[PDB]
Design a binder for this molecule. Structure first.
Ligand SMILES: CC/C(=C(\c1ccccc1)c1ccc(OCCN(C)C)cc1)c1ccccc1
Ligand SMILES: CC/C(=C(\c1ccccc1)c1ccc(OCCN(C)C)cc1)c1ccccc1
Ligand SMILES: CC/C(=C(\c1ccccc1)c1ccc(OCCN(C)C)cc1)c1ccccc1
Ligand SMILES: CC/C(=C(\c1ccccc1)c1ccc(OCCN(C)C)cc1)c1ccccc1
Ligand SMILES: CC/C(=C(\c1ccccc1)c1ccc(OCCN(C)C)cc1)c1ccccc1
Ligand SMILES: CC/C(=C(\c1ccccc1)c1ccc(OCCN(C)C)cc1)c1ccccc1
Ligand SMILES: CC(=O)N[C@H]1[C@H]([C@H](O)[C@H](O)CO)O[C@@](O)(C(=O)O)C[C@@H]1O
Ligand SMILES: CC(=O)N[C@H]1[C@H]([C@H](O)[C@H](O)CO)O[C@@](O)(C(=O)O)C[C@@H]1O
Ligand SMILES: CC(=O)N[C@H]1[C@H]([C@H](O)[C@H](O)CO)O[C@@](O)(C(=O)O)C[C@@H]1O
Ligand SMILES: *[C@@H]1O[C@H](CO)[C@@H](O)[C@H](O)[C@H]1NC(C)=O
Ligand SMILES: *[C@@H]1O[C@H](CO)[C@@H](O)[C@H](O)[C@H]1NC(C)=O
Ligand SMILES: *[C@H]1O[C@H](CO)[C@@H](O)[C@H](O)[C@H]1NC(C)=O
Lengths: 532, 531, 532
């Protein structure tokens, strides 16, 4: 037909029509719409600013660059998570505050379809919005799908602890994109009055953070955190961050005389100079030699004083904040493969023992934060059963998946429920046929596995069993319904109990049926252990 | 008793200078800043108001000319200068200055018409210090202002998007005009009677300002000499991104996105960009390669701010600011100066149908004639005498018509049909100030009227009494236009307005009116191009 | 109990309680409160901007860096003037617009104690606020003592003579601090309505300058210049400064095409690059080989058009400016040791003679500005007495101390007096026990010798005779009383005649008694000599 030409606040944007198998109405797709001014030069380490308005018709027809991040880890994660046929090779640039829109609406008429904003994950160190294709979800459930990008690593989370560089640039970028949604989405047949944000892992945590943030108030109306919340310690730095700032500054070749000096010095560095420092900082990998308490796995969220007025924990204490329908879920085996693999865990033997375990758990301090003293008591409550090493090692991985996502997600769900807001929980237990070959065939419900169902991978990729195609159809219906009514339920779908005092949740997979008190036993155990 | 005028930003000190046979000495101020130096981050951005100074700024030294090829720059300065000694100039990104020549007695109120001169140089070279206003100012009693604007990459670099729209140079130009409105009164000038005039690219600029919304109300009479907004070579229509990327790669930059390019270039040093400017090989006719790829230079673009759409489209609707507009050309635009500089293969002094058609093709950037129509055009002009040397000249007329000839006339007509006072002229004279290397058969070579217009005869030496008179006449004519929007006046031949009869003025040894200038050629090309 | 936490305009500030021998109420000490935004990057060579407000509680508990200067010369001066026990080694940085506060007030209650702002000296090329400890003065006289810093050297006084870099950045920095005191000092139990500014040497000159500046109007209510005023030539550049600018630019490796080109080119230079140029420019040292008229001893105040509308001489002509109680004083032997020492004066023979003298006086042109023709007439009026060479030297040194501080100070005093404003003069003649060993015991009242009494060095240092302890007790009472009522006098202290037509001043030291017409004979002599 004819290229779509929507009219936004900063000017006209031109897209491209794409049809999905067995769908009359073609989906309008705009790739690379800028939602802010490039954070280059002096804008680095500062909040994002409004984008400059353009004069004619901007061609939103090319995949925007992904924020600077280690190019290997980045491309890799893009392949293992992409829900599309071909993995699109991406480019790197500080100029990355862009978002992609997938609208199933017939733009020739008014339309106010629920909007779903996806915040990709990647430990806040890597990732990209272009990885996730919204064609399917948009087509199948009739919702406008928007994929946003935000500053990562040093660029998006470098913090000096003071006003010279507060931090959370990335989250601010996120908040920025949501403001863009409020002021424009209507021109793409979406209802700015019904926005639903949902993210996975670091993306999920972001969502949990926004729910806590004062700035995010009124920018969304329903939230969904998948495999990650604001209590996932590894992503939130509590304590004096000055030391890390100083390390980074030094690694980049900077004086550390004062905060203002460090920030300045760094603003002078070239992107490559900073990408080079990142690599040197050796993030994203498990340090096996050195004090586990000094190892810094990433540059995460902080209590800046603008986005987060206090530790997530304290915050959720007072239900006095913006409470909305919130769906919090986790996967059966979060630490089953994908992560212990990308980080390079000493598990080539495929077996473990009390001694080796306790040592690992200790060296895994940055990820779980368990005191060297309590290590023994924890390693036991989980590995003290069967003497079977291979079982102990499989229990070891559960040990971590519980402290990182399990308990945290449930604790967040509960406080949200007791806040008086509609809460739902789920536990995805399935092994997508899209898994990597290298991932054992026994590992089911690994980290990011639900992604394929959620983004309709079966309808864009190849080889989906008729069983998997159905699983995806259901999950989307469920997700889209939430986006619509703050309740996943609807006819033709199993019943999803609300997460109330009974604590009912939904086990999703080959066999989808409700249950209760998810990880209840674990939340109880860890809570005391940590109480010392 | 140095002149000390008071402007909005502060006091400016100049210098008095007397001209032969004129009681009143002319106050001359060299180097007044009309904008904040576009250095650092200000590069590739619109010009900003200059910082106001505290005491008395000494406007007594020729300001630097914007960065540009020092060789091509200095050479043009000599070949066009209307003064005795050429003044060697300096290069710098800090060049947003203007010079003023006021014949008024600053001890009294005076509101003399103002004439703002926009030098030319293909938007690549040139300076305002080259042209001296002493003469024109004293002789016709008008305040003369010479402005400078960013050239080359510094002034026309465009990414085609909001990250670097382009036309920085033209924006500087508008900047200067705003300055004149808020200050020229302090130099005995009438801010309500400002006339802009340029030569070549400057002529084009003047034509662009007439189409631009931003220029509305900053001038009241316009004059385009050998160049308008339809002189294709100077206006970039089409996706400019490609050229941006090439430039960016040449200077050693990533081309990831638009923002990235602009940012990386902002970081480059002046020398770095001047170096890139040379590498890009602008101003030189590329004889080997696809003529549709050779980029003659960086020019005007349709940015969305200065020009809301192509000049052609704009002049369609007479709904814009219409003012008395004088549009002229010279007998032989492509006679020597232009071809000589770009180094042309006419070292043989003769051509032939085959060779011609090839050149015309390799001159695509200059004329923009499709390889299919080339044969049909090469004929309509060279199809007569078999004399090669005659073809070698008919060839030069061929270019002179597509570049200035027809375009100028087309612009004149649309303005006329807009309901505005329009005048045209055709200068046919060989100044005694021409270069030696210039063949004495060329009469009306590009930029020949400049010597007459700026009274070169009264500043230089050896002007025949016949030339002195031609100059006296042109200025009178120009000045009158600046005064009433009509060149006519007593003591001058009659200059018919450019209405339906299309009367224009042939100027030179024998100055008399005529009609339908290039009429035959306008008609021809118009269709050829209609394919 | 623990930590004081004041609340300022830009956010809360946390300090530390320090008790002084024999004083109940502990003094609240805040070190390093920012009063302006770091003048880094593009902000270099531009007026200082308001500081960025912070989010939580800033820890004002570390000595701020001292502005970029000669680390050797800097630390050395720090030692020779510090009133505290241990000299505190400082750090260098362009980020240095900080001030330190010492408030004896009980912050748990409202208090409006007179405020005393100290502007350290150092020839505008070196120095720092951390050198001077306000604990004593604050405690002993119950005044809030504030020590400020301001850009020195190229960073604070680089001028192009035009609007592209007017200059006096350092003096604007000073004014900025005072505005900060107006808008904040109240929160430290200070009376923003009773601020007194006082400085020694270059700091004294600055005080003298703010008294003439329109920008300083209403930021203070009493002034005190110690050994330095606006007529101390060496510190004020009158004439075309462009030449010097260009030299500096050339030395730093810059094009001098235009003023704006030079400023821009310099902004690009790194701190080290500029520190390196500062060193090459061989400042603060006496050039013995070259035209004395070209030697530039330092970068100083200039007639910018903002801070100073015209030369101090012209300005003081019209009493039409802000007149306030002004105490101007000098030391018995300003040029006795310290300076000739630091500047490296050839006097290693400890003796001189008419010929040698006239040559030095000439080569000391930058410091005194005596034309080569008048040199003979001046060298005589002073050395013409005794044929004793060693006396000629002592006399030679007096010759200088009078042209640089003697006369200048008295002239400033008189004009201020004839303006109708309360004026007081003093002559300090004492040899502190804290002097350097290298300082001959003959010398008394060397440059900056009054500092030890003024800042209560005897109460923080060791070895103060009971005679010295008293001298200090007295000086502070005097200074403090002034800060309080614009009149040093009070009961328990000698009488200090106001500086009226009788021209009564106060000789201070072992024997403190009034006198009259200070340097009167010299003011008269040099006035004509200079009139040629
Ligand atoms: C939020 C969990 C996470 C992840 C992760 C995020 C989303 C999906 C899958 C994994 C991670 C880990 C390592 C990595 O690259 C290692 C480089 N190698 C290729 C050498 C890239 C991403 C993480 C856990 C602890 C510390 C830091 C990040
Ligand atoms: C603990 C389950 C496991 C893992 C595993 C390790 C870390 C995280 C998650 C899983 C495994 C998989 C592949 C492997 O090596 C392939 C050869 N290349 C390295 C060249 C080594 C170890 C395993 C499965 C079956 C048999 C033996 C071990
Ligand atoms: C608008 C016509 C013009 C001119 C011109 C403008 C005003 C007066 C005279 C000539 C031009 C040509 C060559 C040149 O430099 C060659 C030096 N070396 C590179 C050899 C500098 C300027 C031009 C024509 C075609 C392409 C680009 C510009
Ligand atoms: C078309 C005008 C031209 C030109 C010319 C062409 C392009 C640019 C600049 C100048 C010319 C003139 C002299 C010359 O060589 C002299 C050395 N020896 C070989 C004599 C070579 C070419 C010309 C003028 C008169 C007669 C014939 C041609
Ligand atoms: C305004 C009087 C002053 C002083 C001064 C200021 C306050 C207290 C004591 C001395 C000065 C002199 C030399 C010096 O360092 C030499 C380093 N070398 C050993 C390398 C540092 C400061 C001065 C006099 C003339 C020109 C420049 C400054
Ligand atoms: C002007 C007071 C002065 C000075 C002095 C010179 C320049 C700057 C500051 C002080 C002095 C001190 C010691 C000296 O030599 C020691 C070598 N020994 C082997 C003796 C030479 C000169 C002096 C003091 C006492 C007696 C004579 C002169
Ligand atoms: C630079 C580039 O080649 N990519 C395209 C960009 C991209 O959309 C953004 O850089 C990221 O999406 O936008 C354009 O289409 C446009 O504004 O007209 C230009 C170009 O075609
Ligand atoms: C080389 C140059 O142009 N700079 C000069 C500027 C000019 O005013 C402007 O640049 C415009 O001429 O200021 C001076 O003239 C001056 O006031 O002493 C000296 C300086 O050299
Ligand atoms: C970098 C450094 O160690 N200095 C200190 C600075 C100071 O403000 C000034 O730099 C000098 O006191 O910041 C703190 O005070 C702060 O607000 O937390 C603590 C920090 O220790
Ligand atoms: C934008 O896309 C349209 C497709 O209809 C195309 O015509 C246009 O040239 C594109 N923009 C550019 C100049 O790349
Ligand atoms: C500020 O001071 C308090 C107490 O002295 C201390 O607990 C806190 O950690 C300090 N902040 C800094 C600089 O880390
Ligand atoms: C004008 O004044 C400046 C200083 O005010 C002086 O240096 C200059 O010599 C004078 N003009 C010139 C350069 O002739």
């Amino acid at each position: 037909s004819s290229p779509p030409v929507v009219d936004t606040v900063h000017g006209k944007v031109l897209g491209k029509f794409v049809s999905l198998e067995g769908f009359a109405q073609p989906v309008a797709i705009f790739l690379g719409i800028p939602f802010a001014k490039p954070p280059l030069g002096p804008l680095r380490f500062t909040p994002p600013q409004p984008a400059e308005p353009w004069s004619f018709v901007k061609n939103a027809t090319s995949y925007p660059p992904m924020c600077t991040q280690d190019p290997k880890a980045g491309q890799l994660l893009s392949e293992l998570f992409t829900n599309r046929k071909e993995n699109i090779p991406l480019k790197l640039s500080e100029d990355c505050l862009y978002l992609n829109i997938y609208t199933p609406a017939d733009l020739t008429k008014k339309n106010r379809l629920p909007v779903m904003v996806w915040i990709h994950g990647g430990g806040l160190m890597v990732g990209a919005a272009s990885t996730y294709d919204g064609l399917a979800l948009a087509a199948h459930e009739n919702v406008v799908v928007v994929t946003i990008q935000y500053r990562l690593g040093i660029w998006g989370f470098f913090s000096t602890g003071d006003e010279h560089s507060r931090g959370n640039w990335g989250h601010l970028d996120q908040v920025a994109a949501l403001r863009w949604v409020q002021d424009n989405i209507a021109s793409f047949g979406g209802n700015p009055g019904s926005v639903t944000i949902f993210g996975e892992s670091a993306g999920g945590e972001s969502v949990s953070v926004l729910v806590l943030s004062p700035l995010a108030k009124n920018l969304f109306h329903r939230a969904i955190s998948e495999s990650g919340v604001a209590l996932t310690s590894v992503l939130v730095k509590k304590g004096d961050v000055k030391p890390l700032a100083e390390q980074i500054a030094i690694t980049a070749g900077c004086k550390t005389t004062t905060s203002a000096v460090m920030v300045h010095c760094l603003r002078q560095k070239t992107e490559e100079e900073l990408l080079e420092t990142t690599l040197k900082m050796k993030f994203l990998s498990l340090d096996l030699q050195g004090d586990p308490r000094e190892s810094q796995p990433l540059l995460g969220t902080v209590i800046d004083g603008m986005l987060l007025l206090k530790t997530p924990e304290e915050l959720q204490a007072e239900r006095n904040f913006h409470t909305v329908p919130y769906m919090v879920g986790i996967n059966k085996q979060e630490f089953g493969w994908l992560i212990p693999m990308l980080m390079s865990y000493p598990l080539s033997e495929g077996q473990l023992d009390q001694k080796t375990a306790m040592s690992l758990l200790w060296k895994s301090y940055p990820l779980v934060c368990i005191a060297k003293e309590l290590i023994p008591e924890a390693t036991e409550k989980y590995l003290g059963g069967t003497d079977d090493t291979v079982k102990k090692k499989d229990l070891f991985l559960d040990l971590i998946a519980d402290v990182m996502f399990g308990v945290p997600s449930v604790i967040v769900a509960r406080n949200h429920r007791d806040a008086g807001a509609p809460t739902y929980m789920y536990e995805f237990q399935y092994r997508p046929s899209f898994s990597s070959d290298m991932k054992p065939k026994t590992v089911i419900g690994d980290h990011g596995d639900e992604l394929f169902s959620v983004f309709g991978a079966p309808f864009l990729k190849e080889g989906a069993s008729e069983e998997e195609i159905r699983l995806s159809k259901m999950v989307m219906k469920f997700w889209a319904n939430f986006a619509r009514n703050g309740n996943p339920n609807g006819e033709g779908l199993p019943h999803w109990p609300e997460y109330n005092q009974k604590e009912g949740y939904l086990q999703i997979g080959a066999n989808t049926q409700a249950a209760q008190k998810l990880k209840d036993k674990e939340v109880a155990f860890w809570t005391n252990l940590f109480a010392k």
